[PDB]
């Protein structure tokens, strides 16, 4: 029967909701990844990175997990570690919301946080696994192929299924790049439909836009938690990206607030950025009758400590 053996197996099957105050006559639909265990899209890769490491034998009983996170991946790995019986240590920038810090400790993580100015998180972590290489396993979400793979296997197929194959555009903020990569691979390659894959990054740190334009790559600070890593991650397949949209922090925050107040959707800051980007495309006659699906990575209550509220 439909009873999951632990909480890691209950990932996904998140709903699509049509927006009423964005887009043009309902052409913008949002995928609410806040409806997940640990309540972000990252639960998917928290699960699959652990499952994969188990299956190639890098993760065994007694081995301790390590990775670097801006929060949600950390919370995701923590619920999976707790559910499946692993010890776990994580690194994070000091500047991430208190909520992230708060429940990571409740989930029983040995927590380790780094200089906010350095973003830095990736650095010490590696320095930590070196301490006893067969004690610790680093899962490395920015380059681990188990990250986009679970999106190719679940998130993309769900989108295809729930839109009855009518999806024309996928809009997703880029952090690790796993979401837009896996989803795009599923729909374009597995189901065969030539959609428009749209990456979203902060205008303050538009390193994807700069790279593709062959300009000076200049990362910068921003408030859009979860995206804008300030470099091109290995798990972002540039070859499958058709378009890059930049969004500023203010507009991202205002849009998240609008999602709450006008749509009754409890979205996080990066969800506001993705919808703002989607709304701009949706109001181009060229997309005015395409079906645009927007990933909403996380939920509101994870950001009560931030500018969102």
């Amino acid at each position: 029967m439909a009873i999951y053996a632990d909480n890691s197996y209950s990932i996904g099957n998140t709903p699509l909701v049509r927006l009423k105050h964005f887009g043009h006559n309902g052409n913008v639909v949002v995928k609410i990844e806040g409806r997940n265990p640990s309540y972000s899209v990252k639960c998917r890769i928290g699960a699959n990175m652990v499952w994969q490491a188990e299956k190639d034998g890098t993760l065994t009983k007694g081995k301790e997990i390590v990775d670097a996170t801006s929060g949600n991946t950390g919370i995701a790995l923590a619920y999976v570690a707790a559910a499946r019986g692993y010890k776990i240590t994580l690194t994070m920038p000091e500047t991430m919301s208190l909520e992230r810090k708060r429940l990571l400790c409740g989930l029983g993580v040995n927590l380790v946080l780094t200089e906010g100015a350095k973003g830095g998180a990736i650095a010490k972590a590696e320095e930590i696994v070196a301490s006893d290489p067969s004690r610790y396993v680093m899962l490395k979400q920015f380059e681990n192929p188990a990250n986009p793979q679970i999106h190719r296997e679940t998130t993309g197929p769900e989108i295809w299924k729930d839109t009855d194959g009518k999806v024309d555009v996928v809009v997703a903020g880029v952090g690790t790049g796993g979401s837009i990569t896996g989803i795009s691979r599923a729909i374009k390659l597995d189901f065969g439909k030539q959609i428009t894959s749209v990456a979203v990054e902060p205008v303050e740190s538009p390193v994807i836009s700069q790279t593709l334009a062959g300009e000076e790559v200049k990362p910068g600070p921003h408030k859009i938690q979860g995206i804008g890593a300030g470099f091109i991650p290995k798990n972002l397949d540039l070859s499958i990206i058709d378009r890059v949209e930049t969004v500023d922090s203010d507009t991202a925050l205002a849009t998240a607030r609008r999602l709450m107040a006008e749509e009754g959707i409890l979205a996080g800051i990066s969800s506001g950025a993705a919808v703002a980007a989607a709304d701009r495309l949706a109001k181009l006659p060229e997309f005015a009758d395409k079906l645009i699906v927007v990933i909403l990575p996380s939920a509101s209550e994870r950001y009560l400590s931030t500018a969102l509220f």
């Binding site: 801006s70 973003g119 740190s205 859009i224 470099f231």
Partner: peptide
């Protein structure tokens, strides 16, 4: 927020 920056690198990571």
């Amino acid at each position: 927020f920056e690198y990571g």
